[PDB]
């Protein structure tokens, strides 16, 4: 919808209600991802490359604490290739990373806010 209506505020109140906390939510930006090669923060690296023992941001964040709410703030700025990753998060509830360990989002909340329109009906 419009800006300044309180989207992130509603998401943080929802995270407040069923954790009594504020750091259980996993906010990841989408204003970082203008470049096409910068996708691998949330997957990892294939075997034979530099960061391999670490893994991924969005996978190691959910291998522990498997009840979090996740946030994708301003998903318009992401160019149309990040949309192909979370295409398979939805409809399956699984994700794979560099080691080949399928993490399962079967009991998490997914909320992704946008900014399209802004004035129309």
């Amino acid at each position: 919808g419009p800006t300044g209506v309180g989207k992130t505020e509603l998401a943080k109140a929802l995270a407040d209600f069923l954790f009594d906390d504020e750091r259980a939510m996993v906010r990841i930006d989408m204003s970082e991802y203008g470049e096409k090669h910068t996708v691998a923060r949330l997957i990892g690296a294939p075997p034979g490359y530099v960061g391999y023992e670490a893994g991924g941001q969005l996978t190691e964040a959910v291998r522990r604490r498997p009840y979090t709410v996740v946030l994708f703030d301003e998903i318009e700025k992401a160019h149309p290739d990040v949309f192909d990753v979370l295409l398979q998060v939805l409809d399956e509830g699984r994700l794979t990373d560099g080691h080949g360990r399928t993490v399962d989002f079967r009991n998490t909340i997914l909320i992704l806010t946008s900014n399209l329109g802004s004035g129309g009906s």
Partner: peptide, 26 residues
Amino acid sequence: AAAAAAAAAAAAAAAAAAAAAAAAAA
């Protein structure tokens, strides 16, 4: 009357190895 009869031994010392971790150069 008693002799000593010295004995042998076997020593082990292994070796580490490194991985090279290529970089995709972008």
